[PDB]
Symmetry: D2
Subunit: 297 residues, 4 copies
Amino acid sequence: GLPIDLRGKRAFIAGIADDNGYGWAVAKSLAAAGAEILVGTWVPALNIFETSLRRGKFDQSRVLPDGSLMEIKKVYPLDAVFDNPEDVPEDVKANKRYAGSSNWTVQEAAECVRQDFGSIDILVHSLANGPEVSKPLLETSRKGYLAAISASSYSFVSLLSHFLPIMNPGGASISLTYIASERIIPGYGGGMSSAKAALESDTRVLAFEAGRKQNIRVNTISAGPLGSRAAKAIGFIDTMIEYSYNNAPIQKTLTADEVGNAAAFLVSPLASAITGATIYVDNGLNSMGVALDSPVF
Amino acid sequence: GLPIDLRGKRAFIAGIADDNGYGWAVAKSLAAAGAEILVGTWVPALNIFETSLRRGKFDQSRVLPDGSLMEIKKVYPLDAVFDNPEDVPEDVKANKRYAGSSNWTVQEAAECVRQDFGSIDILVHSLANGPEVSKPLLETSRKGYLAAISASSYSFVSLLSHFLPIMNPGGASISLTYIASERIIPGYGGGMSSAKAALESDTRVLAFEAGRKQNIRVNTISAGPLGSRAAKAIGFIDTMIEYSYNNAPIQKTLTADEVGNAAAFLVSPLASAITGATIYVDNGLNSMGVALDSPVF
Amino acid sequence: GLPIDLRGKRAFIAGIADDNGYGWAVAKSLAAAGAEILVGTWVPALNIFETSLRRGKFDQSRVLPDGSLMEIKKVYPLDAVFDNPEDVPEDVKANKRYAGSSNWTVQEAAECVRQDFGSIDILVHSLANGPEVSKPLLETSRKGYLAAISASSYSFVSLLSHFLPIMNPGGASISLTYIASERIIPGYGGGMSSAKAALESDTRVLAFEAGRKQNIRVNTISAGPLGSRAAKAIGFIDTMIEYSYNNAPIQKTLTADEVGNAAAFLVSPLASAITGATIYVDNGLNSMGVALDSPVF
Amino acid sequence: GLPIDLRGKRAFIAGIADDNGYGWAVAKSLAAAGAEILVGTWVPALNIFETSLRRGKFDQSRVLPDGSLMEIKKVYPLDAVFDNPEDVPEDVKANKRYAGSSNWTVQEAAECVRQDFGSIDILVHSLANGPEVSKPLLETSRKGYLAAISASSYSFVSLLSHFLPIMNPGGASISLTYIASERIIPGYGGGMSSAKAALESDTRVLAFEAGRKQNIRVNTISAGPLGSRAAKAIGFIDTMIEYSYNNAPIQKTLTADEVGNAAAFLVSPLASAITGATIYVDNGLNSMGVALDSPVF
Ligand SMILES: NC(=O)c1ccc[n+]([C@@H]2O[C@H](COP(=O)([O-])OP(=O)(O)OC[C@H]3O[C@@H](n4cnc5c(N)ncnc54)[C@H](O)[C@@H]3O)[C@@H](O)[C@H]2O)c1
Ligand SMILES: NC(=O)c1ccc[n+]([C@@H]2O[C@H](COP(=O)([O-])OP(=O)(O)OC[C@H]3O[C@@H](n4cnc5c(N)ncnc54)[C@H](O)[C@@H]3O)[C@@H](O)[C@H]2O)c1
Ligand SMILES: NC(=O)c1ccc[n+]([C@@H]2O[C@H](COP(=O)([O-])OP(=O)(O)OC[C@H]3O[C@@H](n4cnc5c(N)ncnc54)[C@H](O)[C@@H]3O)[C@@H](O)[C@H]2O)c1
Ligand SMILES: NC(=O)c1ccc[n+]([C@@H]2O[C@H](COP(=O)([O-])OP(=O)(O)OC[C@H]3O[C@@H](n4cnc5c(N)ncnc54)[C@H](O)[C@@H]3O)[C@@H](O)[C@H]2O)c1
Ligand SMILES: Oc1cc(Cl)ccc1Oc1ccc(Cl)cc1Cl
Ligand SMILES: Oc1cc(Cl)ccc1Oc1ccc(Cl)cc1Cl
Ligand SMILES: Oc1cc(Cl)ccc1Oc1ccc(Cl)cc1Cl
Ligand SMILES: Oc1cc(Cl)ccc1Oc1ccc(Cl)cc1Cl
């Protein structure tokens, strides 16, 4: 009697290249709520994505609670680091991948969606990129840092800015952030922490700008590490999954649907009084003041 | 395809005395999602509440989206400032109101629910009280301040503590707070600001205690002022409704269902990864750094 | 050329019973900056304190950088849980300790200082007490919780409220809090976490009330665990000292003067633009997002 | 008896081009505490600065409490948007201003200080720049936004990274931020809000990196609007000065020394337990929950 009803709504999801990330999960959730799904796929990944999708490689991942399979109405190539055609270096233009497709700058993708569907109700940003992520900040170059900011923070400003004209009032956008913006997380380097802090601050500022301008709500979800525990935690994400499992207020893993479900709620009319917010979907880790697994205890 | 499904779940809502507050709205929301509703009504208010309910006075307020009317399975008298019978002063015991009913201490109400239904899945705290609320802190007495804390913060600890034994794991609780705990709001006096700060801190602590103990999630909603604008804003709440309307990132009022809908989501399985959180359902006011209506602008 | 100059200023320090806590350290700091020191000693502790002080037991602890020894102008008995004489139970009045001294309620101590010195410039609150501190919140009684709040949070409101009339404008107060108010710290039980959250919220509210009323600044210091490492960390504080040492942005212990020095700065005219603030003097622990000593790393 | 003693310490202050900003005030404060002052002046401003300094134009501004005048040991040209010579476009290299001086990239200035003095104890960052600051975020270009980030956030990472090798352990750095990073402040556009959020997040991360690496403390001061009230507030800063005056917990203006004094304390040994912190020196504005001057009240 209380459904998250997105029927008749259209969502553009930026950042889906496979079925293993949060982007896929949000899409599944919105599709379960009834939304029409449009996807923005990073150019270099476009081919394998469309092909696997075609060969039925993601079919098990497309199954909705309903039992039916999720439908992706259209996949759009996109490279969110470029706003307009004149911004692309021939160096890039000339790469085979970018060579093989077109209309992938933000301005172009937005015009194609306008031409193809005329309007959208929901904008989901689920992308990030940072070439020097494995370096400490003291060792990150200016180019590396600006690259992280450009792909992970400004890309949101650009997408929203370019899609705003076709977003129906009462619509919403959501992005994904991570706690490294507010607390020290060694290993999340290369200015990615910096980028998440900018994205969260922009979320607030854009809630005011877009809110007053078109009645669009803007929020971000600070998500925990995604996945189940590794047989042998090695690598940044594996160790974080284990750490969160041992140390959160509630001991359990985090599954992608958990984030997808929160996002679906946040972009629905049920969330009408929520905007400019940072919602933690991380098993309550962020609230803990000490690690329960420290050997001192 | 994405419903907030609470069918087969039972909720005990503490703090409903009429249909004009947030308590009523949360109940409506949970009832729309399919939950069985039990209500805790403050002793002195019990009579007029049950009577108006009986005369059909709240019928228009009971209408669910469904078109059907909300059913309150049972109303329990309750006074959350008293944990057990031996805690009550004969002075109180002897008052006609308290005289007219029984089993109203927290320990007693919990045993009655156990006897009557055996278990519950959701605990909603929607109550507060503060005798010196109109006084600045510099003028609030020790008794007044402790009274606000006892009824508005400790009452949550007591309810959760007494109901925990009958809460099915995977269950959840939710309370309502207000921004005066974190920022200065002149006029919210008598230690009520103090009480909301304690309630929010306890929410975090209890998410860990109850989370690890019984897999129960615990969150609080920081709500905005409830109601539409007054013809002539006079009084603390009227002026705050107008201030929020003029100054929030999105200009609109806040209706009770807006909070009820967020609560319904938060206590559902869809919110499984969210606990120890303070969720703002206030049109994004809290994020603003300046009042847009200040005459300097 | 830039001295923290408190010469000609008078400070009343509530909460000194020995030379091992933060209260003693703040007094030392203020005394080094030139302030006249008045002390509020908890009644039951009064005797051993004055006696040890007299026998020269604290002499090594009184040595100022200057080489000279700190002078305590006057020790006042005090019990900050009682505002006025009529508030004391004969049960308490009759105890030998309370029996042996007088003028120890907040209202009385304030009148004595007025009679003795006429005015003060600085108010330091360095006290706390919580009978059920070793119990989890789920096991804390209403009386235990209210007792923690009454002695650890409301006592500040009372002292400030009673001393405000004799505080010279441009004066300041400072209290000590702890991170358990904002983050989950297992082991800081009995409502002490709740009390620290109320104290921090009251700090903000009182900065506005006292600021506008008498140009008095009000801030609180969120301090880390005090002391060097135990040979064998056992007990809440020992383990926390070790945890902070291993996990803070800068690896070192925290000494009492470190907090005393920050307090001296905060109550001086140099801090004229700082009020309603929570200053962390904890080696930057609070900023960390993960424990570096978790075995997963 | 409690002096902020910086005698024998050397400070490099990046961002002084005149005597009207916070940079000048921090320098004055450090000079009053006894530090040897080195200044980093933005290339295009270098000439008028050195000349006015020479003609005694800033003499009244150089007067220390002491009565003596502040001495600037050496002015270094600097452009913090360029890390190394190969990073500069001939387009810039060729401009007369950049043409007239040398050794102004971050790497070069750091080597000159090393050659000239060998080491420093304190690093002060007091600079920012944002070409599109007057535009809302929805209208800011990718280049404009990245430019703000590059000059206002990454410049700090670069300076610290390049000076770290010559900073004596136990040293400290301080930067200046503004609340627009955490709350919505209409008018602080062009990604400057984004840049301040990144700078604050980097402050935390660098407190860990530099703290563990060389025992260097890193903090930032969130300052209020600088200056007294305008006869007619027009322009972003004038209106903000008036707004803060009317709305802060304590009604008064903010003078540059107020910030300079806090900075001097923060970079001194007295602040040894403080790192990764955001200290508000803004008359407590940030704590307010509503504007007292809103017409609704
Ligand atoms: N994975 C986690 O544990 C976790 C935790 C917190 C936040 N997040 C955030 O969630 C979002 C999704 O990350 P994920 O973990 O699902 O990984 P993912 O690789 O599935 O998602 C990142 C996506 O960004 C896309 N992308 C990269 N550069 C792009 C560009 N220039 N243009 C267009 N698309 C580009 C990739 O193709 C990819 O689909 C990110 O914002 C990430 O920071 C992830
Ligand atoms: N109304 C608002 O604008 C607003 C904004 C933020 C938060 N809130 C919070 O929402 C909750 C609900 O408030 P509301 O505005 O709906 O008002 P309300 O009067 O409808 O709710 C308060 C309830 O507390 C009950 N109550 C008081 N003392 C009690 C006691 N000793 N034992 C048992 N019940 C007792 C009353 O009977 C009443 O039903 C409170 O926690 C309040 O602080 C309200
Ligand atoms: N010790 C730490 O590691 C630490 C860390 C953070 C905060 N703090 C805070 O610092 C303050 C000082 O604590 P401390 O550790 O120095 O211990 P302490 O025992 O030296 O200080 C507490 C003081 O409170 C006094 N006191 C207790 N009940 C009182 C009453 N009813 N009336 C008057 N005085 C009373 C005691 O006599 C004692 O002097 C407290 O507020 C505490 O919460 C301490
Ligand atoms: N002025 C205020 O009210 C206020 C309030 C909060 C924070 N702040 C912050 O205080 C710091 C100082 O600002 P201010 O108001 O004193 O103004 P200011 O103009 O005195 O300081 C900014 C300085 O940055 C320098 N600068 C700009 N681009 C540079 C570059 N590429 N390389 C080297 N130097 C460059 C300028 O030459 C100038 O000296 C900034 O970080 C600002 O954001 C100012
Ligand atoms: O933000 C994240 C946080 C976590 Cl715990 C795990 C993955 C994350 O996502 C990214 C991190 C860095 C880069 Cl370069 C790209 C992405 Cl998608
Ligand atoms: O918390 C509240 C906040 C707002 Cl804006 C309006 C009403 C609120 O609710 C209360 C406030 C004080 C007392 Cl004594 C009782 C209640 Cl129910
Ligand atoms: O607040 C504190 C925090 C820490 Cl880590 C250590 C001691 C503290 O101080 C107290 C804690 C509880 C009680 Cl009952 C009394 C006091 Cl003085
Ligand atoms: O940060 C600031 C905040 C305020 Cl209230 C006033 C001035 C500030 O400083 C700047 C703001 C924008 C740019 Cl482009 C450069 C500088 Cl120095």
